[PDB]
Amino acid sequence: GVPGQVDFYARFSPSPLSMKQFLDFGSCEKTSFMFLRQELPVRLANIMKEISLLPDNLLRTPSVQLVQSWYIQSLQELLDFKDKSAEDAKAIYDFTDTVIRIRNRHNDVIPTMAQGVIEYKESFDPVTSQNVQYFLDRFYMSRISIRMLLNQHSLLFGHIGSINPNCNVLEVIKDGYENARRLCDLYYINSPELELEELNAKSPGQPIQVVYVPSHLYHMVFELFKNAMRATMEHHANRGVYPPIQVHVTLGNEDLTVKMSDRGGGVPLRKIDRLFNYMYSTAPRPRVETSRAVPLAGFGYGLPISRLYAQYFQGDLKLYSLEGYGTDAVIYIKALSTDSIERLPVYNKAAWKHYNTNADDWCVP
Amino acid sequence: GVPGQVDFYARFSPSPLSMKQFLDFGSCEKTSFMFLRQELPVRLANIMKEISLLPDNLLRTPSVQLVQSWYIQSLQELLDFKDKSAEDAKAIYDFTDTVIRIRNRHNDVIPTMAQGVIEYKESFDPVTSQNVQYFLDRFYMSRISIRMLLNQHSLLFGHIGSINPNCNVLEVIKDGYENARRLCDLYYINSPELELEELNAKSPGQPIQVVYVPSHLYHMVFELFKNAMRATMEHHANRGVYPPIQVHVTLGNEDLTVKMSDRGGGVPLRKIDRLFNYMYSTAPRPRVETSRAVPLAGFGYGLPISRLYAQYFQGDLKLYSLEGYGTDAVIYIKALSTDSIERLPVYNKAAWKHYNTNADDWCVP
Numbered sequence: 001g002v003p004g005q006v007d008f009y010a011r012f013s014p015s016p017l018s019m020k021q022f023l024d025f026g027s028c029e030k031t032s033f034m035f036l037r038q039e040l041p042v043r044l045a046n047i048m049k050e051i052s053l054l055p056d057n058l059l060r061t062p063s064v065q066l067v068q069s070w071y072i073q074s075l076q077e078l079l080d081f082k083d084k085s086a087e088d089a090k091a092i093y094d095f096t097d098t099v100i101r102i103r104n105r106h107n108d109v110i111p112t113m114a115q116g117v118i119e120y121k122e123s124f125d126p127v128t129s130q131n132v133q134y135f136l137d138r139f140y141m142s143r144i145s146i147r148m149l150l151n152q153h154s155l156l157f158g159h160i161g162s163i164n165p166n167c168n169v170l171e172v173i174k175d176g177y178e179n180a181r182r183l184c185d186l187y188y189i190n191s192p193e194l195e196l197e198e199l200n201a202k203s204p205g206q207p208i209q210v211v212y213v214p215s216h217l218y219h220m221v222f223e224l225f226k227n228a229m230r231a232t233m234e235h236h237a238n239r240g241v242y243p244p245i246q247v248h249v250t251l252g253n254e255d256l257t258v259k260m261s262d263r264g265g266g267v268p269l270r271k272i273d274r275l276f277n278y279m280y281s282t283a284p285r286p287r288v289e290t291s292r293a294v295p296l297a298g299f300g301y302g303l304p305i306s307r308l309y310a311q312y313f314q315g316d317l318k319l320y321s322l323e324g325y326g327t328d329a330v331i332y333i334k335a336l337s338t339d340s341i342e343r344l345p346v347y348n349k350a351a352w353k354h355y356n357t358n359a360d361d362w363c364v365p
Numbered sequence: 366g367v368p369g370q371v372d373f374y375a376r377f378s379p380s381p382l383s384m385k386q387f388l389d390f391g392s393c394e395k396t397s398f399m400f401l402r403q404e405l406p407v408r409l410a411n412i413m414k415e416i417s418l419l420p421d422n423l424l425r426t427p428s429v430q431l432v433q434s435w436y437i438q439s440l441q442e443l444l445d446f447k448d449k450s451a452e453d454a455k456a457i458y459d460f461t462d463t464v465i466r467i468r469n470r471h472n473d474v475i476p477t478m479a480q481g482v483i484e485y486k487e488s489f490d491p492v493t494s495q496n497v498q499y500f501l502d503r504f505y506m507s508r509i510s511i512r513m514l515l516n517q518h519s520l521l522f523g524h525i526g527s528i529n530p531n532c533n534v535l536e537v538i539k540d541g542y543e544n545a546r547r548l549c550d551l552y553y554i555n556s557p558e559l560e561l562e563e564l565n566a567k568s569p570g571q572p573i574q575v576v577y578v579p580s581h582l583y584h585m586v587f588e589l590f591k592n593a594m595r596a597t598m599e600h601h602a603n604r605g606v607y608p609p610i611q612v613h614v615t616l617g618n619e620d621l622t623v624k625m626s627d628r629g630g631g632v633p634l635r636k637i638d639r640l641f642n643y644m645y646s647t648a649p650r651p652r653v654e655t656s657r658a659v660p661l662a663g664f665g666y667g668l669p670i671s672r673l674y675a676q677y678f679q680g681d682l683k684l685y686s687l688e689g690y691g692t693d694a695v696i697y698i699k700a701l702s703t704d705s706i707e708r709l710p711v712y713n714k715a716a717w718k719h720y721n722t723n724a725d726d727w728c729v730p
């Protein structure tokens with residue numbers, strides 16, 4: 001059975017790696033094969049059990065059925081190697097090929113799962129919508145983790161893979177700003193300027209670098225800029241004077257922090273968490289047949305996924321807004337590669353109970 | 366039995382009031398009596414069941430035994446009225462006297478419970494210390510609620526009680542600043558200046574007022590100033606140049622926000638929650654027999670209790686710090702009295718399970 005393969009591997013826990021451990025891999029293709037031939041089936045199988053717990057009307061959508069079919073095909077291909085000899089040179093070539101194969105094929109899972117959620121809302125619940133939120137954080141975090149392993153192995157055996165041991169933080173920030181700004185200019189015919197301030201408390205006046213995945217940092221800052229820009233342009237639309245977006249970067253002993261500050265009018269505290277809510281953030285997918293500029297907010301789960309990127313390596317992404325004034329968004333990244341450990345979801349009794357269960361200890365307002 | 370009185374009333378839930386409802390009371394002593402003769406025993410009894418669930422070595426301390434004895438005496442005195450005639454003028458005089466009696470006697474519960482926690486740490490656990498954190502938020506929130514009812518009734522029948530329908534927010538802030546500053550000058554022989562900015566988005570350039578309890582707002586800002594000041598003076602000690610504390614007040618449609626910003630060097634994200642942790646924040650009580658200035662941090666649970674004040678009426682108090690640079694503390698208050706509903710703990714099966722129970726669904730770092 002294919003349910004049997006899934007059940008067997010889902011019993012196991014994923015094995016989180018530190019950023020330092022990823023970095024030591026890039027220094028032996030055989031040592032990666034032995035790791036990944038178990039780890040990948042375990043990671044795939046754990047998340048696949050949760051897909052199965054989705055509301056039937058979500059599960060049954062064309063998009064989710066497509067995504068599930070991809071996971072099933074991927075598992076079966078990796079489980080073709082379970083016994084195949086560790087000493088065999090063809091098998092490891094075939095593995096690195098299968099990994100490269102799987103990586104370079106399904107870049108589309110994130111918007112496709114997001115289409116499934118649209119298909120779900122369109123044809124059809126508050127009880128099960130808590131399940132959807134729980135699942136999607138776990139699914140997308142799992143995906144980040146699985147993609148990380150596929151990317152490292154394909155880059156090394158196909159800068160230490162996708163890790164830059166010396167990630168230039170301000171450079172990434174400025175690239176994120178310029179790319180967001182181009183989109184802002186397109187949609188609003190104007191855009192806020194950037195004011196960038198830095199403090200290396202660790203070593204004052206020296207460049208701020210960390211061991212990091214640059215494309216992760218990019219996704220986070222690019223998405224935050226888009227959000228800051230939209231808030232700014234929509235708030236000050238009447239005045240025609242648009243306050244800059246202010247970014248403060250600090251390297252401390254333990255935390256790299258990127259604070260992004262806008263004067264876009266804020267959101268009250270009751271509402272601010274909606275920005276991280278999949279069911280609320282499920283906006284229409286921009287249509288192909290138009291020359292009209294793409295809006296800076298909408299489809300694609302930019303903010304919730306940005307936060308998952310922060311949290312993946314034990315960082316965080318927090319928003320706090322002052323309604324009527326503006327918003328601060330703060331990225332927290334671990335300054336030390338040894339503190340940077342994968343945050344991985346695991347399927348077990350506790351995960352299953354979350355889908356099948358549900359603060360009585362406080363009086364309701 | 367006295368356990369029996371407690372059990373009977375603890376079955377009931379506390380009945381949270383809105384700020385608007387408190388305000389309508391002050392417009393009929395008889396209508397308050399009928400309310401409080403049930404509500405007070407219910408509130409006392411619910412919290413008393415949780416005191417009983419404390420670790421034995423905490424429960425048995427002299428200080429906690431004293432506090433429990435006060436709760437027991439208070440309950441017994443209010444339950445002297447349960448049947449006594451609602452139409453009787455002497456009984457209502459005797460009730461308003463009993464309420465006034467109870468209020469004007471035990472102003473000391475908060476440091477006394479905090480002494481109990483010192484006595485507990487001194488002579489004696491990580492499992493039960495989660496119970497202590499859970500209890501103390503609930504106990505101190507309960508206390509705020511019970512004191513509120515005692516204060517309203519004693520003020521009205523002994524500005525709408527302790528509620529000011531037109532609380533001048535900046536005035537309270539400046540009073541909090543000056544009082545903190547005097548203590549800062551005493552301990553550090555210097556202090557940061559205040560920079561105060563305001564925005565009434567609701568009605569631009571008009572004074573910012575809300576329906577609120579001024580002494581609650583005072584406690585919050587005074588405690589935050591002390592914290593901002595200590596961080597500032599201790600960070601910049603070598604330079605002898607001390608950056609101002611910057612406060613931004615905004616009235617929006619739904620939220621009154623007070624942002625307090627310091628350049629006191631911050632705390633990494635791993636540690637920032639310790640400021641709200643009772644067992645970690647349990648510092649030595651300042652000794653009487655000295656002329657040495659009292660430190661701005663230490664004994665008394667200022668920050669955790671400040672946050673309980675914010676949350677009591679559906680507000681919040683959040684900290685976010687940039688390690689190596691500084692910290693923002695944000696008070697969130699409901700702008701509308703009708704959104705301002707008491708947040709009350711309730712004893713039931715769920716509360717009991719919290720003491721007798723214990724994220725397996727994620728991999729540990």
Ligand SMILES: [K+]
Pocket residue numbers: 009010011012013014046346347348
């Ligand atoms: K598992």
Ligand SMILES: [K+]
Pocket residue numbers: 374375376377378379411711712713
């Ligand atoms: K109860």
